[PDB]
Design an enzyme around this catalytic site. Structure first.
Site, PDB file in Angstrom:
ATOM      1  CD  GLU A  78      -2.663   1.193   2.595  1.00  0.00           C
ATOM      2  OE1 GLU A  78      -2.064   0.927   3.653  1.00  0.00           O
ATOM      3  OE2 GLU A  78      -3.874   1.504   2.532  1.00  0.00           O
ATOM      4  CD  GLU A 169      -6.653   7.473   4.802  1.00  0.00           C
ATOM      5  OE1 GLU A 169      -5.623   7.396   4.094  1.00  0.00           O
ATOM      6  OE2 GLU A 169      -6.996   6.545   5.579  1.00  0.00           O
TER       7      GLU A 169
END
EC number: 3.2.1.8
Lengths: 182, 368
Positions: A78, A169
């Site tokens: 990630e 985010e």
């Protein structure tokens, strides 16, 4: 290329709108959030193509990132290239890999092992990579190849990409964002 | 300063341990009232007569298969086995902390019951006993509070893997990047129990409130437990919650969820090839408990599904046995280990409240 992928993890915690053909999205969370969302637009399969974006990003009152975000299939990873952020700089907590210079700023680079956590193939053990811009900004070109090449000195596959987006985010506080991916 | 120990989730048993001393570990039991271990010499029996306040306290919550110098009755919270044991002086060897990182070695004196080695069955390899973290005077947090002169309060960050965090003694909650907006709900003391209880006023599957009978969700109706990895549900809540979950899951060109034969102790299990995923884990219906104070305790796939064997994952809601539907003496819900994982939990027995900060997806208790 044209946008073909929508990232929407808990977009319902605020007001997420997008238009894939126009390359635009916005995410408003001025009432605040108390859980993590990751929203954005990009591509089903990432690449080392440069990403150019323009954004209004207001997150001084939020724990939040404005970032290129994606995964690598193998070795599983990630990653984030953080262009701007709110009240938390994500390389403070992590193992340092030094720095990389790209697109007019030094970026701090850090990595972590993620053990028995959710991933694109279920519960897994994988590696996480962050580049965090020292001179934060809300528009420009991210020469992703420079980041990926540097991370590849530290285990990043730099090939066999899964999805890749420009994302916002947040997981605390309140803010707003509007982004265009040219 | 407060005392810090790293927390390990044992792969074989799913139980959480901390190092105690001498390479021995203890199992964290948040409903357990005693610290107990096997002993040898140098854990000599304390000078405690069985009429003193300390002895009556040590016997205050007898385990079902156990009636009544001091002799306490340590309880194995996995097998349910109990046995007679003497109270003895022992050492909890750890580090102090000024936040989340170790500062200095510390040796904390605590009273533990000395149990026979047979009581270790079903505990992790290398464990020699149980660290009770319930709200009572001889549990580990209370004993650390008096010995180290810190608060009657502890923090848990239980890991899915890698080293998590337990801090005994309070202070500001660390990691403000994740905990600055920590929600709190009252801790409810229930008669005859030292356990930690909180109150859910609603349960939601997806965006839809689960219809439960009137009075089903009551004050102190949710208990916390590290004994099992999954949630236990009283039958009156089990039925509507599971029906809502399985209906929603069935309604999600990818494979459609396919039920398979249940693997004990679970009642509802699926072919993992027929489940998707997202950043919260398996792509199954979100479940939220609306708690007193106005915040929700959330469950995603990492909390609501357990991988049991290759090809099979089971729903982490299991119906209580031996408890009638609607029996208000029992909790409606007992949250377990995998629903506490990757939450920073502030068990404050002075302010009588529980802080619960779910970590965002990119981090977790392991390595925190």
């Amino acid at each position: 290329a044209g946008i073909n992928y929508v990232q929407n993890y808990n977009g319902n915690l605020g007001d997420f709108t997008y238009d894939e053909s126009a390359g635009t999205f916005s995410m408003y969370w001025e009432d605040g959030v108390s859980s993590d969302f990751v929203v954005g637009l990009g591509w089903t399969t990432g690449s080392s193509n440069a990403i150019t974006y323009s954004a209004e990003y207001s997150a001084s009152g939020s724990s939040s990132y404005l970032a290129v975000y994606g995964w690598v299939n193998y070795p599983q990873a990630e990653y984030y290239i953080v262009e701007d952020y709110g009240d938390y700089n994500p390389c403070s907590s992590a193992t340092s890999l030094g720095t990389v210079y790209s697109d007019g700023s030094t970026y701090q680079v850090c990595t972590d092992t993620r053990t028995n956590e959710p991933s694109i193939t279920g519960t897994s053990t994988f590696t996480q990579y962050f580049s965090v811009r020292e001179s934060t900004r809300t528009s420009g070109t991210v020469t992703v190849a420079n980041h990926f090449n540097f991370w590849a000195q530290h285990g990043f596959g730099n090939s066999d990409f899964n999805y890749q987006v420009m994302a916002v985010e947040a997981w605390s506080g309140a803010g707003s964002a509007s982004v265009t991916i040219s | 300063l407060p005392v810090l120990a790293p927390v390990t989730k044992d792969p074989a048993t799913s139980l959480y341990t901390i190092p105690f001393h001498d390479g021995a570990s203890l199992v964290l039991d948040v409903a357990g009232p005693l610290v107990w271990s096997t002993c040898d010499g140098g854990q000599p029996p304390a000078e405690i007569p069985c009429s003193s306040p300390t002895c009556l306290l040590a016997n205050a919550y007898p385990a079902p298969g156990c009636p009544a110098p001091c002799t306490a009755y340590p309880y194995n919270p996995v097998s349910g086995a109990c046995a007679a044991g003497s109270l003895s002086h022992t050492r909890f060897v750890a580090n102090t902390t000024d936040g989340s990182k170790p500062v200095s070695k510390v040796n904390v004196g605590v009273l533990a019951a000395c149990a026979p080695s047979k009581l270790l069955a079903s505990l992790p390899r290398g464990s020699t006993g149980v660290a009770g973290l319930a709200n009572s005077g001889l549990a580990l947090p209370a004993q650390v509070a008096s010995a180290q002169k810190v608060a009657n309060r502890f923090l848990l960050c239980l890991p899915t893997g890698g080293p998590g965090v337990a801090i005994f003694g309070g202070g500001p909650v660390p990691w403000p990047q994740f905990t600055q907006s920590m929600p709190y709900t009252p801790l409810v003391t229930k008669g005859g129990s030292p356990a930690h209880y909180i109150s859910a006023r609603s349960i939601v599957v997806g965006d839809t409130r689960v219809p439960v009978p009137e009075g089903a969700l009551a004050t102190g109706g949710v208990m916390l437990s590290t004994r099992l990895p999954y949630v236990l549900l009283r039958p009156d809540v089990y039925r509507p919650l599971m029906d809502a979950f399985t209906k929603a899951l069935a309604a999600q060109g990818a494979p459609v969820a396919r039920a398979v034969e249940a693997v004990a102790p679970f009642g509802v299990c699926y072919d993992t090839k027929t489940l998707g995923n997202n950043l919260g884990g398996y792509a199954v219906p979100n479940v939220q408990l609306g708690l007193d104070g106005g915040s929700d305790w959330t469950m995603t796939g990492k909390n609501s599904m357990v991988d049991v064997k290759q090809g099979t994952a089971c729903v982490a809601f299991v119906e209580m046995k031996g408890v009638a539907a609607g029996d208000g003496r029992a909790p409606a819900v007992i949250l377990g280990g995998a629903q506490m994982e990757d939450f920073v939990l502030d068990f404050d027995m002075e302010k009588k409240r529980l802080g619960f900060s779910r970590l965002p997806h990119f981090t977790g208790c392991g390595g925190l």
